[PDB]
Amino acid sequence: GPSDMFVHTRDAIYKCAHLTNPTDETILLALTADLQVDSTNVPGPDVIPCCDCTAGCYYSRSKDRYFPVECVSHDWYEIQESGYYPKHIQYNLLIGEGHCEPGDCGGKLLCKHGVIGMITAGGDNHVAFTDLRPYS
Numbered sequence: 001g002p003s004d005m006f007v008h009t010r011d012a013i014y015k016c017a018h019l020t021n022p023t024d025e026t027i028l029l030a031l032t033a034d035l036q037v038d039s040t041n042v043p044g045p046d047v048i049p050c051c052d053c054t055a056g057c058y059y060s061r062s063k064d065r066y067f068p069v070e071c072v073s074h075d076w077y078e079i080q081e082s083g084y085y086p087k088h089i090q091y092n093l094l095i096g097e098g099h100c101e102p103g104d105c106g107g108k109l110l111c112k113h114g115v116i117g118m119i120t121a122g123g124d125n126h127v128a129f130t131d132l133r134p135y136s
């Protein structure tokens, strides 16, 4: 569960858009958030809180462990060119100090109340999460 690179709530599945494709169960697609949301008939264990938290813990796939992390909100952020996207702007980010490598996208960010984010980009001791709360 903690290692899953997606968020699975009672009614929906949240994935990083570049890691999937639109399907007939897609209910939200936002490339400005690198986010795809699909409806699902099978209930999931995760909960997206309506809290205000910016601090918690996240899964790092490259290190294969969880890290504590403290984040700051950014309305928008410049993501550098990768392999799936050109250099572009993304919206609603949480940014914290922490390790991040290519391949870590989708790793969950949790506060006490539930999952609030997913790794979407990161670099030199910075990790960027899309805040899922605006989109739930």
Ligand SMILES: [Zn+2]
Pocket (backbone or CB within 6 Å): 049, 051, 052, 053, 111, 112, 113, 114
């Ligand atoms: Zn919280």
